[PDB]
Design a protein around this ligand. Sequence first.
Ligand code: HEC
Ligand code: HEC
Ligand SMILES: [Zn+2]
Ligand SMILES: [Zn+2]
Lengths: 136, 136
Amino acid sequence: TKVKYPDGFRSWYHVKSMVIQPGHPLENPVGGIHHVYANAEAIQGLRGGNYPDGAVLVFDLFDYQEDNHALVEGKRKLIGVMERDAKRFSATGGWGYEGFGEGKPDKRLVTDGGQGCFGCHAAQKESQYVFSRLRD
Amino acid sequence: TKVKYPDGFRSWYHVKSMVIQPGHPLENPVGGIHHVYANAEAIQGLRGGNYPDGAVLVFDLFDYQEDNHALVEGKRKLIGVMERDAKRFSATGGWGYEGFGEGKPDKRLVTDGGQGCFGCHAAQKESQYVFSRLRD
Ligand code: HEC
Ligand code: HEC
Ligand SMILES: [Zn+2]
Ligand SMILES: [Zn+2]
């Protein structure tokens, strides 16, 4: 019933990025530069196939510094993780939701079985609870 | 003596990202959100080895739209490409420097055999002419 830490996610496929700056509704708690990563199984789902069990998506969040009209990546704040298991994570739509503080395997963040996460991702039922779109 | 178009670069290892905002000394031409990618061979150099022939680094530049203090990726503006070949690219320190407008293989940007590119990258001779640092 727990989400596996996604070991080696930094070597996976880079889906997309975004910057969330102060004044953005979501600046607490996902302010910063984020990168979405997808393992091979998650790419099947992102391309418009179905997500196999074992699909993992990672939201990789960095603090940033202002450096002379540049935003420069600072420390990692956290990662968010969605792991596909239709049976084991059926209470949250077939995805397990977990957060790791500073991307550390020992700093698990989710306390409610991922019901809060799922609460928002549920809006994306039609794209199997994934916001991120594959781009060129 | 032309740099090959790095087909498949979007499936490569994501090294790092940076936002260059208007007013940066290099807004013309690299204003936008950029993502650096490395093929397997380029990873060897980023980790502290010698860059082998066939190492390729890509600078993937996107426009962005500031939308309610999110910076949202728009269209690709260009890619920059460094291709390692100690013999063939000897005049520019063993890297071949090319740009592709909108990331299209038909839209070569470099017109001076890469001397201007080399002129700036020479400052990084001690890190084999590479600015980007591999981060976890
Ligand atoms: C709305 C109020 C959200 C809540 C609460 C959570 N997430 Fe979410 N997440 C949200 C958005 C708008 C996005 C897209 C970001 C973008 O750049 O487009 C995401 C994305 C993720 C991802 C990447 C996969 C995807 O769906 O795009 C992961 C892995 C992810 N989120 C995990 C996650 C977890 C673990 C949450 C609870 C701790 C959680 N999210 C909350 C919107 C919202
Ligand atoms: C200084 C005035 C530069 C000139 C002219 C060119 N480049 Fe360069 N480039 C520069 C910096 C500071 C960086 C690092 C960006 C970062 O996020 O840290 C880069 C990066 C690249 C890369 C990625 C590999 C690396 O060295 O980090 C490539 C592939 C690259 N640049 C290509 C490139 C080409 C093709 C150029 C002439 C058209 C060129 N650059 C010019 C600084 C400067
Ligand atoms: Zn200024
Ligand atoms: Zn703003």
